[PDB]
Each structure stands twice: as C-alpha cells, then as structure tokens.
PDB file of C-alpha atoms and ligand atoms in Angstrom:
ATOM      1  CA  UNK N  44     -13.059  -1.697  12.510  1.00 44.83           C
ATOM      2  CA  UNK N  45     -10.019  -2.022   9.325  1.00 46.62           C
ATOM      3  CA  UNK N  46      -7.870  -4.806   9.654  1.00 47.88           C
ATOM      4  CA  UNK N  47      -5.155  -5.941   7.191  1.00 47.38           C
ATOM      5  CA  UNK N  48      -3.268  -8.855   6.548  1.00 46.69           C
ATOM      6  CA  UNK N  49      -0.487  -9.015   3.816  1.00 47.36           C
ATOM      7  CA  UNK N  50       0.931 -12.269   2.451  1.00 48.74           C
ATOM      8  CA  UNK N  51       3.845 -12.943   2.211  1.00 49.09           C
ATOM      9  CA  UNK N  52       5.085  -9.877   4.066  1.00 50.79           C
ATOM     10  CA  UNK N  53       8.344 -11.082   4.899  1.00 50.14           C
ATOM     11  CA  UNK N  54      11.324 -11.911   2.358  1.00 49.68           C
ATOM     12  CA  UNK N  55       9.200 -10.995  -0.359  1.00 50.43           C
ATOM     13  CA  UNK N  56      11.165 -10.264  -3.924  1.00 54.29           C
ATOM     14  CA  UNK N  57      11.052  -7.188  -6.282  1.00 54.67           C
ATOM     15  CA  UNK N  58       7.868  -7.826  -8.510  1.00 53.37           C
ATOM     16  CA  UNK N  59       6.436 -10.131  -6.327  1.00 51.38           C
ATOM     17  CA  UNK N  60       2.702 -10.015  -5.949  1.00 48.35           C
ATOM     18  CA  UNK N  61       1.006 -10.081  -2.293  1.00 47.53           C
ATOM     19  CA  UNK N  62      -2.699 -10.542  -1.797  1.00 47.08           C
ATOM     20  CA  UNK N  63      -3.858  -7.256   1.234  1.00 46.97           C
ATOM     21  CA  UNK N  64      -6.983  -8.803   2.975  1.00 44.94           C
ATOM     22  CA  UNK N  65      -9.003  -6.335   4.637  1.00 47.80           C
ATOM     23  CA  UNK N  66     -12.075  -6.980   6.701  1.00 44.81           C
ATOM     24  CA  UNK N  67     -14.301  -4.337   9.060  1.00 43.07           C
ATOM     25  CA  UNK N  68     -14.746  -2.002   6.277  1.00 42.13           C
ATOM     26  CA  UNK N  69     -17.540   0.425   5.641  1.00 45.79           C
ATOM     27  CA  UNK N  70     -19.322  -1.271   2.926  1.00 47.61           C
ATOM     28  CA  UNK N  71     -19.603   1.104  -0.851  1.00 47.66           C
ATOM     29  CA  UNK N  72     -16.370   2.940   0.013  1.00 49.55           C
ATOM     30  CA  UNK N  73     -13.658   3.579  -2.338  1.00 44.09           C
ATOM     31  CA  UNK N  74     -10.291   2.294  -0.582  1.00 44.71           C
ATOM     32  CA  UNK N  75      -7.148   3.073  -2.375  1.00 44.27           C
ATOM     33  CA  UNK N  76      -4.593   0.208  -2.284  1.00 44.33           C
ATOM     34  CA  UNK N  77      -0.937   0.871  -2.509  1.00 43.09           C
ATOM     35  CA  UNK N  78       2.530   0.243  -1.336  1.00 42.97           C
ATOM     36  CA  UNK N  79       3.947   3.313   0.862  1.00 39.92           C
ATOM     37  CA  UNK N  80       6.604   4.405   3.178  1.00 42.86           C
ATOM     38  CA  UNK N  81       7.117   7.919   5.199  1.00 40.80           C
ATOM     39  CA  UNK N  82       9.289   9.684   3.248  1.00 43.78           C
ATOM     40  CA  UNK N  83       9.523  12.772   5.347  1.00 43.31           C
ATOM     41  CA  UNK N  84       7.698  13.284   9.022  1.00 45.23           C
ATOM     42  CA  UNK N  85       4.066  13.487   8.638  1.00 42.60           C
ATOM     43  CA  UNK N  86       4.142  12.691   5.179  1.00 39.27           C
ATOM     44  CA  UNK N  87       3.772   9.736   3.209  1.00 38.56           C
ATOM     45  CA  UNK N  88       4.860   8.770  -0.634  1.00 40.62           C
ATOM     46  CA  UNK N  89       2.925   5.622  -2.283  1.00 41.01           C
ATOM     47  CA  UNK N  90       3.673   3.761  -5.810  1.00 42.34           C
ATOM     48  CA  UNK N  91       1.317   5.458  -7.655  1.00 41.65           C
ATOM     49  CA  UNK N  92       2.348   2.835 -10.545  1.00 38.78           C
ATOM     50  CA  UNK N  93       0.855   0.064  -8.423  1.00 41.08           C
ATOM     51  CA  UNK N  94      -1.799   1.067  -6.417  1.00 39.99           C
ATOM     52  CA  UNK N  95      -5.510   0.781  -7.240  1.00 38.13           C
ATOM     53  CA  UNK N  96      -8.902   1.379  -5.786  1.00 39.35           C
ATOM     54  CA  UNK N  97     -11.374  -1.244  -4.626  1.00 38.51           C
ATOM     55  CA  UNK N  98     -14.763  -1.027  -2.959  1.00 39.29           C
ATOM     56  CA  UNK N  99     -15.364  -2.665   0.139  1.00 43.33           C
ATOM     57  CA  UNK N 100     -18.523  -5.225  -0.298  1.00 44.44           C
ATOM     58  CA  UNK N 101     -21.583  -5.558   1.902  1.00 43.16           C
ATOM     59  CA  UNK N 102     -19.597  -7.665   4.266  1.00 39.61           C
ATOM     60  CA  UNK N 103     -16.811  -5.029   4.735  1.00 40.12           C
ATOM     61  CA  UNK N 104     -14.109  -6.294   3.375  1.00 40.90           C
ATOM     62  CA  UNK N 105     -11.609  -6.046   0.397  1.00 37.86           C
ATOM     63  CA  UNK N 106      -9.505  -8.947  -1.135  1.00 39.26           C
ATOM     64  CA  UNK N 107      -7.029  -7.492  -3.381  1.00 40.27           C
ATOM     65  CA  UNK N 108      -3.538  -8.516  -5.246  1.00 40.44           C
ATOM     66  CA  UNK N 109      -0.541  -5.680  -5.562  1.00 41.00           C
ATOM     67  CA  UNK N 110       2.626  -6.059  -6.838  1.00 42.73           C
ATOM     68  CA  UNK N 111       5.344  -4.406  -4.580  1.00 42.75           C
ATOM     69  CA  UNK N 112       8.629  -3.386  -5.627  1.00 41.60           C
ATOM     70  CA  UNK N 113      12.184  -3.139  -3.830  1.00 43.17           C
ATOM     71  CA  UNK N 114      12.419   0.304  -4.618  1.00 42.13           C
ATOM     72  CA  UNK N 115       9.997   2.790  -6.314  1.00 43.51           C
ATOM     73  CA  UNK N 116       9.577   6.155  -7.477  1.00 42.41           C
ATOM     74  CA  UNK N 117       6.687   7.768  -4.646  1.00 41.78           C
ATOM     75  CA  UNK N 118       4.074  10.443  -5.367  1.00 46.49           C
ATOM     76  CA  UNK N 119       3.069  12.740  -2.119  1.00 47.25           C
ATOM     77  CA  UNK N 120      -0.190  14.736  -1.820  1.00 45.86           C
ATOM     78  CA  UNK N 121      -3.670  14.454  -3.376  1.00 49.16           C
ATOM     79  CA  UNK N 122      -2.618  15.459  -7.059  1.00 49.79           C
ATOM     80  CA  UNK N 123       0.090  12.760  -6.790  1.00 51.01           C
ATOM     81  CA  UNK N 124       3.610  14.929  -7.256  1.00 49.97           C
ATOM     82  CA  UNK N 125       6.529  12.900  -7.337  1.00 51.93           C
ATOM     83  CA  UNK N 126       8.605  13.262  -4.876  1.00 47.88           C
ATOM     84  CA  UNK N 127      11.871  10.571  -5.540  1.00 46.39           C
ATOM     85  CA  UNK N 128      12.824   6.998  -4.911  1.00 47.37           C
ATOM     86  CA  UNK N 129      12.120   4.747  -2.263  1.00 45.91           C
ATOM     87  CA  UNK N 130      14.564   2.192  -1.235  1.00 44.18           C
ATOM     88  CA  UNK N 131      13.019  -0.502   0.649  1.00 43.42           C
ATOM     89  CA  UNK N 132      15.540  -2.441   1.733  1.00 39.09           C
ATOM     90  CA  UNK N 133      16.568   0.698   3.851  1.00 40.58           C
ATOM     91  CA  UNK N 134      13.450   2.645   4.898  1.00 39.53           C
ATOM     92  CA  UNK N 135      10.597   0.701   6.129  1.00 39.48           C
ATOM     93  CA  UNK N 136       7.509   0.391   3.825  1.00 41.31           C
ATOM     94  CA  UNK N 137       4.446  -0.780   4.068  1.00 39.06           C
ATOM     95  CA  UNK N 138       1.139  -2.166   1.915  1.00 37.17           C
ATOM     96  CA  UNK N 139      -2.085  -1.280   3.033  1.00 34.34           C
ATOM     97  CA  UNK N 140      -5.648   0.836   2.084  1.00 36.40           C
ATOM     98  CA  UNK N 141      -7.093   3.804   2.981  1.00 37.43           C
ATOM     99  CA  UNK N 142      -9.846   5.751   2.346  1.00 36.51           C
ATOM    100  CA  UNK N 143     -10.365   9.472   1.409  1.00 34.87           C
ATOM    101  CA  UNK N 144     -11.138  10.127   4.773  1.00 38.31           C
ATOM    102  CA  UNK N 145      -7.896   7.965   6.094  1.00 36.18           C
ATOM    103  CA  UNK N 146      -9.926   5.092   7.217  1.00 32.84           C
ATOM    104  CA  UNK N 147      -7.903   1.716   6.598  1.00 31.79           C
ATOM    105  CA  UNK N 148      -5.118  -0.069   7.800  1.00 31.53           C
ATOM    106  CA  UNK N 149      -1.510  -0.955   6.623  1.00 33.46           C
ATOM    107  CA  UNK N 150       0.906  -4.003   7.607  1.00 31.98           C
ATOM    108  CA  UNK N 151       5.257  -3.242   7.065  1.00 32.14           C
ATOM    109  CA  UNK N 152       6.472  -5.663   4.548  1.00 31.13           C
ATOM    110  CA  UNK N 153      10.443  -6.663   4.057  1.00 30.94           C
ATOM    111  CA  UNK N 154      12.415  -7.503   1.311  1.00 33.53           C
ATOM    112  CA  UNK N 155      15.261 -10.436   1.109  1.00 30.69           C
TER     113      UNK N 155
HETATM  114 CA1  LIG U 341      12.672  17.334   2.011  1.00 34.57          CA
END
C-alpha cells in the first residue's frame, strides 16, 4: 500500500533538497522519483533534470533525496517531450514516485 512523506514540504527554497520516504512498496520495482505538476487535464509534466529511479527493497520501501526547483522546464509522455515551464509558486506541484504501471504516491510541496 504506497505511502509518501516529503520533508520539508512547506516553504521550501529553489535548489533545496527534500528527502521522499516511501514505504508499502512492491519490493524489486523500479519507481521513478521526480518533481511534477498537471500541466494540462489528465496530463502530467515532471523535471526530467531531477528525477531518478530507485528500487524498492525487500521491506518495500524507498528513501530517496531530490532537489526541487521553483520553476522548471517539464517533459510529458513516455519519450519525455518537453512541453514548457512550470511555475511553482503559481500552479501546484508535487514530489512523489511512481511506477511503470502508476503504482506510487505523491505529497504537494510549496515554495516561500
Ligand atoms: Ca495545450
């Protein structure tokens, strides 16, 4: 059963690095760990600059560090096309991890 936690999630700063814990995993899979918002209804644009993939260990869960950003330039799709930028500070985002099958979790994160 995914669960995330993000800290700090609040106030944070452009550049700032935030540990994602995740726990209720499915041990051996590949989650992909990234900061993302919805940038148009039913779809959703991540850093690909920052994200990065981490599998879950026999106890289910992942323990990871990201660096989120204020703003940032977000790919859509599976072959990552970029898509434009991402103001934070005026569209929610989030940081979270997924799986290929869309498995995961995510927590909204604000900037001062
Ligand atoms: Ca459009």
């Amino acid at each position: 059963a995914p669960g995330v936690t993000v800290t700090p999630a609040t106030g944070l700063s452009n550049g700032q690095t935030v540990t994602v814990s995740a726990t209720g995993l499915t041990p051996g899979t590949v989650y992909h760990v990234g900061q993302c918002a919805v940038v148009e209804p039913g779809v959703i644009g991540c850093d690909a600059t920052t994200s990065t993939d981490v599998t879950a260990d026999a106890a289910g869960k992942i323990t990871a560090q990201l660096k989120v950003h204020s703003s940032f330039q977000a790919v859509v799709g599976a072959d990552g096309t970029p898509w434009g930028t991402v103001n934070c500070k005026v569209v929610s985002c989030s940081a979270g991890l997924g799986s290929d099958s869309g498995e995961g979790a995510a927590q909204a994160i604000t900037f001062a």
